Design an enzyme around this catalytic site. Structure first.
Site, short mmCIF file in Angstrom:
data_model
loop_
_atom_site.label_atom_id
_atom_site.label_comp_id
_atom_site.label_asym_id
_atom_site.label_seq_id
_atom_site.Cartn_x
_atom_site.Cartn_y
_atom_site.Cartn_z
N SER A 48 0.75 -1.24 0.00
CA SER A 48 0.00 0.00 0.00
C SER A 48 0.79 1.30 0.00
O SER A 48 0.20 2.35 -0.23
CB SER A 48 -0.88 0.11 1.24
N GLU A 146 -3.71 -7.21 -6.80
CA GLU A 146 -2.67 -8.10 -7.32
C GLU A 146 -1.25 -7.62 -7.04
O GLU A 146 -0.32 -8.44 -6.95
CB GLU A 146 -2.84 -8.32 -8.82
#
Ligand SMILES: [Cl-]
Length: 268
Positions: A48, A146
């Protein structure tokens, strides 16, 4: 005479022994120019943590697209993926680009990040922004979720701790962005809610910190980068990234914070 980097390195090595994986660290003192570097040019998955640079790229676009930030993006259920707590809340209305940016940065919202990637022309558009400021290391290839696969040996969706820190410095402290956009990025980073057990845990409470975290959920792979402003002193920029060789190796926030503490304390 220069620093004895072997002495600076030693406690990171000890940390990574109990961890069972690799720790990558780069820290730069913008006042003195001192640095701490440990596996700083090794690649680690972004997870992230790409979302900080995403928001910067969005802010860059806004400089050339007036009122982009206040433009609502109204999406259907295909935008949604798990770990998207803010964008899920506004499915029935939509969110502005600024709201999406804040959500991606401060709650690590996945769908929000995908929506903003689409605005930039996909992962390649974010990588292109990073090339524009002289980051040749950063690569985002895939989308949420992904891009979190963190498969050992995969260079896709990775950067280095050094390139992360360098890019973060340019965008938050340097003049790479226009001043309002720079202050907006810093404010979004300062309001992160997901980083309290990482770099922040190593910094005295009264010092301002802005950060963005990543947790791939596999291969002991997790991270954080930050700007730290000690009261009355030049700010510090730093990045701490981990990975580990087995899918089921646990990431550790404690390790991240300890590495941050070692890095910050080692700066001349
Ligand atoms: Cl849809």
């Amino acid at each position: 005479a220069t620093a004895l980097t072997n002495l600076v390195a030693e406690p990171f090595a000890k940390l990574e022994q109990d961890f069972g994986g690799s720790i990558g660290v780069y820290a730069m003192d913008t006042g003195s120019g001192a640095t701490v570097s440990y596996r700083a040019e090794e690649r680690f998955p972004l997870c992230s943590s790409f979302k900080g640079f995403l928001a910067a790229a969005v802010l860059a676009r806004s400089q050339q697209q007036a009122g982009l930030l206040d433009t609502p993006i109204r999406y259907g259920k295909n935008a949604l993926v798990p770990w998207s707590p803010i964008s899920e809340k506004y499915l029935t209305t939509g969110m502005t680009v600024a709201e999406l940016s804040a959500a991606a940065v401060q709650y690590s919202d996945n769908a929000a990040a995908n929506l903003l990637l689409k605005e930039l022309g996909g992962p390649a558009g974010l990588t292109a922004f990073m090339r524009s400021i002289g980051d040749t290391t950063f690569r985002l290839d895939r989308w949420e979720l992904e891009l979190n696969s963190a498969i050992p040996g995969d260079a896709r969706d990775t950067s280095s701790p050094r390139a992360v820190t360098e890019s973060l410095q340019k965008l938050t402290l340097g003049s790479a962005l226009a001043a309002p956009q720079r202050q907006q990025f810093v404010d979004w980073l300062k309001g992160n809610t997901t980083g309290n057990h990482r770099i922040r845990a190593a910094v005295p409470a009264d010092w301002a910190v802005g950060d963005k975290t990543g947790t791939c959920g596999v291969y002991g792979t997790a991270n954080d980068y930050a700007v730290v402003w000690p009261t009355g002193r030049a700010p510090i920029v730093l990045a701490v990234y981990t990975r580990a060789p087995n899918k089921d190796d646990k990431h550790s926030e404690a390790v991240i914070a300890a590495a941050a503490r070692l890095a910050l304390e080692g700066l001349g």
